[PDB]
């Protein structure tokens, strides 16, 4: 049941070993996070390994990597690190990541925009949760991404046409178009941001 | 340092 299972104890033992190994060599932690691991492990690694706060040192270096997967993983890792550690330098790296996403909005093509912004959009909810000063930057970025992604929805004919559904209520929490999926992801992320900030 | 939390008390020599 994700808490009273053998998998939880195995995860704790592995997290303890990784904590010891990262203390013994932080360069191993830097190399592993440059290689990357599945993002399902990210909350487990951030919560269970206390020496994960040193990842904020090379997240500015990791987010500058040419490969898109490295930048996606850097943003997703900083997402959990800002929740775990709300540092002033964590805020600086969060501002850097917001600027990187704003720049990659205007650098990447439409397929690359989908493949980059679908995983990294839930990171903005955690960025807003850790740093309430980031509300203006996150909301301006979300307006920009949504207005960019509505335009190529209008470019091609669509099977569901989300422009008409601009007046929709709060919905409950497969072969759809990538642009419409990205529009729904933007709407979902602003829904979670507003729900988090209201609570 | 990886061995200390960022919120841990600092050591002043």
């Amino acid at each position: 049941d994700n808490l009273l299972c053998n998998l939880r104890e195995v995860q704790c033992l592995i997290c303890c070993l990784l904590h010891q190994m990262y203390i013994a060599d932080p360069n191993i932690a830097k190399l592993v996070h440059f290689q990357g691991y599945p993002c399902e492990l990210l909350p487990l690694t951030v919560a269970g390994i206390p020496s994960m706060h040193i990842c904020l040192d090379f997240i500015p270096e990791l987010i500058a990597q040419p490969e898109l997967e490295k930048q996606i993983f850097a943003i997703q890792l900083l997402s959990h690190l800002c929740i775990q550690y709300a540092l002033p330098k964590s805020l600086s790296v969060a501002r850097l990541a917001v600027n990187v996403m704003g720049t990659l909005l205007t650098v990447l093509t439409q397929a690359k925009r989908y493949a980059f912004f679908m995983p990294t959009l839930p990171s903005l909810v955690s960025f807003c949760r850790a740093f309430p000063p980031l509300y203006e930057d996150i909301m301006s970025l979300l307006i920009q991404i949504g207005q960019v992604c509505a335009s190529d929805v209008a470019t091609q004919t669509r099977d569901i046409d989300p422009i008409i559904t601009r007046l929709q209520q709060i919905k409950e929490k497969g072969s759809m178009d990538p642009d419409v999926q990205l529009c729904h992801c933007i709407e979902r992320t602003v829904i979670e941001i507003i729900n988090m900030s209201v609570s | 340092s990886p061995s200390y939390s960022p919120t841990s008390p600092s050591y002043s020599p």
Partner: protein, 87 residues
Amino acid sequence: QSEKHLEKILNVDEFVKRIFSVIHSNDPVARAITLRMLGSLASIIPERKNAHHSIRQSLDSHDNVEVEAAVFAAANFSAQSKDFAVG
């Protein structure tokens, strides 16, 4: 191995402070080793309240080596201090 010679150092405060600084380490092994240091030094720092608080806090930790070291430190400090023993 040098328990009889550590009663003649007389710069107790800064020595114990620079050992005690790595009770705040996130490593449970380092915390356990420091608890064993405090229990080893309990002859020359009785009624040292931050050591008592560290033993009390580490007795409730989730790491087995840290709890065992806290038990060892509590056994040493209870022998050398009655104010530690009563709580």
